[PDB]
Short mmCIF file of all heavy atoms in Angstrom, two decimals:
data_model
loop_
_atom_site.label_atom_id
_atom_site.label_comp_id
_atom_site.label_asym_id
_atom_site.label_seq_id
_atom_site.Cartn_x
_atom_site.Cartn_y
_atom_site.Cartn_z
N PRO X 1 119.39 99.95 98.26
CA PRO X 1 118.54 100.17 99.46
C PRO X 1 117.02 100.35 99.11
O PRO X 1 116.67 101.06 98.20
CB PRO X 1 119.10 101.51 100.02
CG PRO X 1 120.50 101.54 99.51
CD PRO X 1 120.49 100.90 98.16
N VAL X 2 116.16 99.80 99.98
CA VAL X 2 114.76 100.06 99.98
C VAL X 2 114.51 101.45 100.53
O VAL X 2 115.05 101.74 101.64
CB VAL X 2 113.88 99.11 100.84
CG1 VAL X 2 112.37 99.37 100.70
CG2 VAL X 2 114.20 97.65 100.55
N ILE X 3 113.83 102.33 99.83
CA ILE X 3 113.48 103.72 100.35
C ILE X 3 111.98 103.84 100.63
O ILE X 3 111.62 104.83 101.21
CB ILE X 3 114.05 104.75 99.40
CG1 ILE X 3 113.62 104.63 97.91
CG2 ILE X 3 115.54 104.83 99.52
CD1 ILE X 3 112.14 104.96 97.62
N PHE X 4 111.19 102.88 100.13
CA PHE X 4 109.78 102.87 100.45
C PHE X 4 109.18 101.47 100.38
O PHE X 4 109.73 100.69 99.55
CB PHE X 4 108.96 103.80 99.51
CG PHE X 4 107.50 103.88 99.85
CD1 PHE X 4 107.08 104.62 100.96
CD2 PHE X 4 106.54 103.20 99.16
CE1 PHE X 4 105.73 104.72 101.28
CE2 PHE X 4 105.19 103.23 99.46
CZ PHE X 4 104.81 104.03 100.52
N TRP X 5 108.28 101.12 101.23
CA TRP X 5 107.59 99.88 101.09
C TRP X 5 106.17 99.95 101.60
O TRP X 5 105.83 100.97 102.33
CB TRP X 5 108.25 98.73 101.84
CG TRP X 5 108.63 98.82 103.32
CD1 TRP X 5 108.15 99.79 104.15
CD2 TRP X 5 109.43 97.91 104.04
NE1 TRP X 5 108.67 99.50 105.46
CE2 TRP X 5 109.39 98.35 105.44
CE3 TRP X 5 110.11 96.74 103.71
CZ2 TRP X 5 110.10 97.71 106.39
CZ3 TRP X 5 110.81 96.10 104.69
CH2 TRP X 5 110.83 96.51 106.00
N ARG X 6 105.31 99.06 101.05
CA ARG X 6 103.84 99.11 101.40
C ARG X 6 103.24 97.75 101.01
O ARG X 6 103.52 97.26 99.93
CB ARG X 6 103.29 100.24 100.50
CG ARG X 6 101.85 100.59 100.82
CD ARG X 6 101.76 101.70 101.87
NE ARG X 6 100.43 102.21 102.03
CZ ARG X 6 100.02 102.77 103.17
NH1 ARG X 6 100.75 102.71 104.30
NH2 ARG X 6 98.86 103.33 103.24
N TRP X 7 102.41 97.27 101.88
CA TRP X 7 101.59 96.05 101.62
C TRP X 7 100.67 96.32 100.42
O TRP X 7 100.00 97.32 100.37
CB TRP X 7 100.84 95.56 102.81
CG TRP X 7 101.78 94.83 103.82
CD1 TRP X 7 102.40 95.42 104.87
CD2 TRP X 7 102.28 93.52 103.74
NE1 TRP X 7 103.24 94.50 105.49
CE2 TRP X 7 103.19 93.31 104.79
CE3 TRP X 7 102.06 92.44 102.84
CZ2 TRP X 7 103.81 92.13 105.01
CZ3 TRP X 7 102.61 91.18 103.11
CH2 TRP X 7 103.50 91.06 104.17
N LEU X 8 100.73 95.45 99.36
CA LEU X 8 99.92 95.58 98.13
C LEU X 8 98.64 94.69 98.26
O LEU X 8 97.63 94.94 97.65
CB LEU X 8 100.78 95.12 96.95
CG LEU X 8 102.04 95.93 96.71
CD1 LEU X 8 102.77 95.45 95.50
CD2 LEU X 8 101.82 97.45 96.63
N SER X 9 98.80 93.63 99.03
CA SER X 9 97.68 92.61 99.25
C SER X 9 97.90 91.97 100.56
O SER X 9 98.96 92.24 101.22
CB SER X 9 97.61 91.57 98.09
OG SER X 9 98.64 90.60 98.21
N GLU X 10 97.02 91.02 100.95
CA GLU X 10 97.28 90.18 102.13
C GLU X 10 98.48 89.27 102.01
O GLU X 10 99.04 88.83 102.99
CB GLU X 10 96.09 89.33 102.44
CG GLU X 10 94.83 90.20 102.92
CD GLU X 10 94.86 90.58 104.44
OE1 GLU X 10 95.24 89.75 105.23
OE2 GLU X 10 94.63 91.75 104.61
N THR X 11 99.00 88.98 100.74
CA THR X 11 100.12 88.14 100.54
C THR X 11 101.37 88.86 100.14
O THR X 11 102.46 88.39 100.36
CB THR X 11 99.86 87.14 99.40
OG1 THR X 11 99.74 87.87 98.23
CG2 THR X 11 98.65 86.27 99.65
N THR X 12 101.25 90.07 99.50
CA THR X 12 102.32 90.72 98.77
C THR X 12 102.75 92.01 99.33
O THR X 12 101.94 92.93 99.50
CB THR X 12 101.93 90.73 97.28
OG1 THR X 12 101.79 89.40 96.91
CG2 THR X 12 103.09 91.38 96.41
N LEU X 13 104.07 92.19 99.59
CA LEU X 13 104.73 93.36 100.03
C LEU X 13 105.44 94.03 98.89
O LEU X 13 106.22 93.33 98.15
CB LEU X 13 105.69 93.10 101.22
CG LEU X 13 106.45 94.26 101.73
CD1 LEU X 13 105.54 95.45 102.27
CD2 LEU X 13 107.37 93.77 102.82
N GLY X 14 105.23 95.31 98.66
CA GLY X 14 105.87 96.11 97.60
C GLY X 14 107.05 96.89 98.12
O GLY X 14 106.97 97.40 99.19
N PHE X 15 108.13 96.96 97.31
CA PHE X 15 109.35 97.63 97.65
C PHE X 15 109.76 98.60 96.56
O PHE X 15 109.56 98.29 95.35
CB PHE X 15 110.55 96.67 97.83
CG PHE X 15 110.42 95.51 98.76
CD1 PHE X 15 109.56 94.47 98.49
CD2 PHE X 15 111.04 95.50 99.97
CE1 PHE X 15 109.33 93.42 99.36
CE2 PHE X 15 110.85 94.48 100.87
CZ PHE X 15 110.07 93.39 100.56
N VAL X 16 110.26 99.76 96.89
CA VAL X 16 110.81 100.71 95.89
C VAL X 16 112.17 101.15 96.39
O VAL X 16 112.36 101.53 97.55
CB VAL X 16 109.86 101.96 95.79
CG1 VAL X 16 110.34 102.96 94.69
CG2 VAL X 16 108.42 101.58 95.54
N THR X 17 113.13 101.07 95.44
CA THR X 17 114.54 101.51 95.67
C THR X 17 114.73 102.83 94.92
O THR X 17 113.76 103.32 94.29
CB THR X 17 115.48 100.44 95.19
OG1 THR X 17 115.53 100.34 93.75
CG2 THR X 17 115.13 99.06 95.72
N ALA X 18 115.90 103.40 94.93
CA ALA X 18 116.22 104.58 94.11
C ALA X 18 115.90 104.39 92.62
O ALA X 18 115.58 105.28 91.92
CB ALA X 18 117.61 105.07 94.31
N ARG X 19 116.02 103.11 92.12
CA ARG X 19 115.97 102.87 90.66
C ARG X 19 114.94 101.82 90.31
O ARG X 19 114.46 101.82 89.11
CB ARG X 19 117.24 102.19 90.18
CG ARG X 19 118.64 102.85 90.53
CD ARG X 19 119.74 102.35 89.66
NE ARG X 19 120.94 103.09 90.14
CZ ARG X 19 121.94 103.61 89.38
NH1 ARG X 19 122.24 103.12 88.16
NH2 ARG X 19 122.70 104.51 89.83
N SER X 20 114.43 100.97 91.23
CA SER X 20 113.60 99.82 90.92
C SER X 20 112.34 99.73 91.82
O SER X 20 112.23 100.28 92.89
CB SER X 20 114.45 98.57 90.86
OG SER X 20 114.64 98.15 92.15
N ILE X 21 111.47 98.88 91.30
CA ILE X 21 110.19 98.49 91.98
C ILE X 21 110.15 97.03 92.05
O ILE X 21 110.36 96.38 91.01
CB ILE X 21 108.96 99.19 91.28
CG1 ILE X 21 109.09 100.72 91.20
CG2 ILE X 21 107.69 98.73 92.00
CD1 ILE X 21 108.43 101.32 90.07
N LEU X 22 109.94 96.42 93.22
CA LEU X 22 109.97 94.93 93.45
C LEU X 22 108.71 94.51 94.28
O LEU X 22 108.15 95.37 94.94
CB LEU X 22 111.23 94.54 94.13
CG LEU X 22 112.54 95.06 93.53
CD1 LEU X 22 112.98 96.29 94.29
CD2 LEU X 22 113.58 94.02 93.39
N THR X 23 108.35 93.21 94.23
CA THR X 23 107.36 92.65 95.09
C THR X 23 107.80 91.33 95.60
O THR X 23 108.54 90.59 94.96
CB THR X 23 105.99 92.57 94.41
OG1 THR X 23 106.02 91.50 93.44
CG2 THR X 23 105.53 93.87 93.75
N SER X 24 107.30 90.92 96.79
CA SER X 24 107.55 89.64 97.39
C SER X 24 106.23 89.07 97.87
O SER X 24 105.50 89.71 98.58
CB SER X 24 108.51 89.82 98.61
OG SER X 24 108.61 88.55 99.26
N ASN X 25 105.99 87.80 97.49
CA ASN X 25 104.92 87.04 98.14
C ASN X 25 105.49 86.44 99.44
O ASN X 25 106.19 85.48 99.52
CB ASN X 25 104.41 85.87 97.23
CG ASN X 25 103.24 85.11 97.96
OD1 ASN X 25 103.05 85.15 99.13
ND2 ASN X 25 102.51 84.33 97.17
N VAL X 26 105.20 87.18 100.49
CA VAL X 26 105.89 87.00 101.76
C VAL X 26 105.47 85.66 102.39
O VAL X 26 106.22 85.11 103.19
CB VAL X 26 105.45 88.22 102.70
CG1 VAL X 26 105.87 87.96 104.15
CG2 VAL X 26 106.09 89.43 102.15
N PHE X 27 104.30 85.04 101.96
CA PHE X 27 103.85 83.83 102.55
C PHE X 27 104.08 82.60 101.65
O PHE X 27 103.56 81.53 101.94
CB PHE X 27 102.34 84.00 102.84
CG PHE X 27 102.15 85.11 103.88
CD1 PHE X 27 102.01 86.42 103.42
CD2 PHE X 27 102.04 84.81 105.20
CE1 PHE X 27 101.84 87.43 104.32
CE2 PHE X 27 101.80 85.85 106.12
CZ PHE X 27 101.68 87.17 105.68
N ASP X 28 105.06 82.70 100.68
CA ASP X 28 105.26 81.60 99.76
C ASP X 28 106.17 80.54 100.35
O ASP X 28 106.32 79.43 99.72
CB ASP X 28 105.70 82.14 98.42
CG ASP X 28 107.07 82.74 98.35
OD1 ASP X 28 107.83 82.67 99.29
OD2 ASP X 28 107.42 83.21 97.13
N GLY X 29 106.81 80.82 101.49
CA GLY X 29 107.62 79.75 102.18
C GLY X 29 109.06 79.81 101.73
O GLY X 29 109.84 79.04 102.32
N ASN X 30 109.47 80.64 100.76
CA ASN X 30 110.82 80.74 100.25
C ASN X 30 111.53 81.87 100.99
O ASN X 30 111.64 82.96 100.54
CB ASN X 30 110.78 80.93 98.76
CG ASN X 30 112.08 80.60 98.06
OD1 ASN X 30 113.09 80.42 98.70
ND2 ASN X 30 112.03 80.54 96.72
N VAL X 31 112.01 81.49 102.19
CA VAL X 31 112.44 82.54 103.18
C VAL X 31 113.50 83.42 102.61
O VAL X 31 113.43 84.64 102.79
CB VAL X 31 112.86 81.94 104.52
CG1 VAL X 31 113.32 82.99 105.53
CG2 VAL X 31 111.71 81.13 105.08
N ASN X 32 114.53 82.82 101.91
CA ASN X 32 115.67 83.55 101.53
C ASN X 32 115.61 84.13 100.15
O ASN X 32 116.56 84.79 99.73
CB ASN X 32 116.92 82.66 101.73
CG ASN X 32 117.06 82.27 103.19
OD1 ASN X 32 116.98 81.12 103.52
ND2 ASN X 32 117.18 83.30 104.06
N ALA X 33 114.44 84.03 99.45
CA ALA X 33 114.38 84.53 98.12
C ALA X 33 114.25 86.09 98.16
O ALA X 33 113.37 86.66 98.89
CB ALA X 33 113.12 83.97 97.44
N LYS X 34 115.05 86.78 97.33
CA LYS X 34 114.89 88.23 97.21
C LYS X 34 113.56 88.55 96.55
O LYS X 34 113.03 87.72 95.81
CB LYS X 34 116.07 88.89 96.46
CG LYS X 34 117.39 88.62 97.24
CD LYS X 34 118.55 89.52 96.71
CE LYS X 34 118.91 89.24 95.32
NZ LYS X 34 120.30 89.63 95.17
N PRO X 35 113.00 89.79 96.76
CA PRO X 35 111.79 90.20 96.00
C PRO X 35 112.07 90.20 94.51
O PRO X 35 113.21 90.45 94.06
CB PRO X 35 111.58 91.67 96.49
CG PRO X 35 112.22 91.62 97.89
CD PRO X 35 113.48 90.84 97.64
N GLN X 36 111.07 89.82 93.74
CA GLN X 36 111.19 89.83 92.26
C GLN X 36 110.98 91.26 91.72
O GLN X 36 110.10 91.99 92.14
CB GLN X 36 110.05 88.89 91.75
CG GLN X 36 110.22 88.67 90.23
CD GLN X 36 109.07 87.74 89.83
OE1 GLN X 36 107.93 88.01 90.02
NE2 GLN X 36 109.49 86.52 89.33
N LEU X 37 111.84 91.64 90.76
CA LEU X 37 111.76 92.92 90.09
C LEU X 37 110.37 92.93 89.46
O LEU X 37 109.93 92.01 88.76
CB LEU X 37 112.81 92.96 88.95
CG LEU X 37 112.78 94.17 88.02
CD1 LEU X 37 113.17 95.48 88.74
CD2 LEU X 37 113.59 93.91 86.84
N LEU X 38 109.71 94.12 89.61
CA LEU X 38 108.47 94.35 88.90
C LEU X 38 108.82 95.15 87.62
O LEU X 38 108.60 94.69 86.45
CB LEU X 38 107.48 95.10 89.80
CG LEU X 38 106.08 95.32 89.22
CD1 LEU X 38 105.25 94.04 89.03
CD2 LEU X 38 105.28 96.26 90.01
N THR X 39 109.45 96.31 87.86
CA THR X 39 109.93 97.11 86.68
C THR X 39 110.91 98.12 87.22
O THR X 39 110.91 98.39 88.45
CB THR X 39 108.71 97.80 85.97
OG1 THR X 39 109.15 98.58 84.90
CG2 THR X 39 107.94 98.70 86.93
N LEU X 40 111.58 98.84 86.29
CA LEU X 40 112.37 100.03 86.72
C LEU X 40 111.43 101.15 87.03
O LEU X 40 110.38 101.28 86.47
CB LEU X 40 113.41 100.46 85.66
CG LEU X 40 114.52 99.47 85.40
CD1 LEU X 40 115.40 100.07 84.30
CD2 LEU X 40 115.36 99.20 86.68
N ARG X 41 111.90 102.13 87.91
CA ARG X 41 111.15 103.40 88.06
C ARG X 41 111.26 104.18 86.75
O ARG X 41 112.27 104.26 86.12
CB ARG X 41 111.86 104.21 89.17
CG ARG X 41 111.53 103.62 90.53
CD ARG X 41 112.30 104.25 91.66
NE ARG X 41 112.31 105.75 91.62
CZ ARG X 41 112.45 106.51 92.68
NH1 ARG X 41 112.78 106.02 93.87
NH2 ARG X 41 112.42 107.84 92.56
N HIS X 42 110.18 104.90 86.43
CA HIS X 42 110.10 105.81 85.34
C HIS X 42 110.83 107.08 85.75
O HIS X 42 110.80 107.50 86.93
CB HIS X 42 108.55 106.10 85.09
CG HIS X 42 108.30 106.77 83.80
ND1 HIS X 42 108.56 108.11 83.51
CD2 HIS X 42 107.93 106.22 82.58
CE1 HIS X 42 108.30 108.38 82.20
NE2 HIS X 42 107.88 107.21 81.70
N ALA X 43 111.42 107.74 84.81
CA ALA X 43 112.14 109.04 84.98
C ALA X 43 111.24 110.10 85.67
O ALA X 43 111.81 110.98 86.28
CB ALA X 43 112.68 109.55 83.66
N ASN X 44 109.93 110.03 85.53
CA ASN X 44 109.02 111.04 86.14
C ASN X 44 109.12 111.09 87.63
O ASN X 44 108.74 112.04 88.28
CB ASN X 44 107.59 110.91 85.68
CG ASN X 44 106.82 109.63 86.24
OD1 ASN X 44 107.46 108.69 86.71
ND2 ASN X 44 105.54 109.77 86.23
N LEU X 45 109.46 109.90 88.18
CA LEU X 45 109.56 109.79 89.66
C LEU X 45 110.96 110.22 90.13
O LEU X 45 111.21 110.23 91.36
CB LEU X 45 109.27 108.36 90.11
CG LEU X 45 107.84 107.86 89.86
CD1 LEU X 45 107.70 106.47 90.39
CD2 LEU X 45 106.81 108.72 90.42
N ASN X 46 111.81 110.67 89.22
CA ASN X 46 113.17 111.18 89.58
C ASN X 46 113.00 112.30 90.56
O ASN X 46 112.12 113.11 90.42
CB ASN X 46 114.02 111.58 88.40
CG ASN X 46 114.46 110.36 87.59
OD1 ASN X 46 114.35 109.21 88.00
ND2 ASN X 46 115.06 110.62 86.40
#
């Protein structure tokens, strides 16, 4: 599950799950592509 999201740029939407951080270029035309992993969340954000 997505627990937080926020626009990072005019093209890119950021997503945070319980364990991961992802981004999507929403305007790239690839409608069904999942957001690409950016990195895991650090333990400090636990």
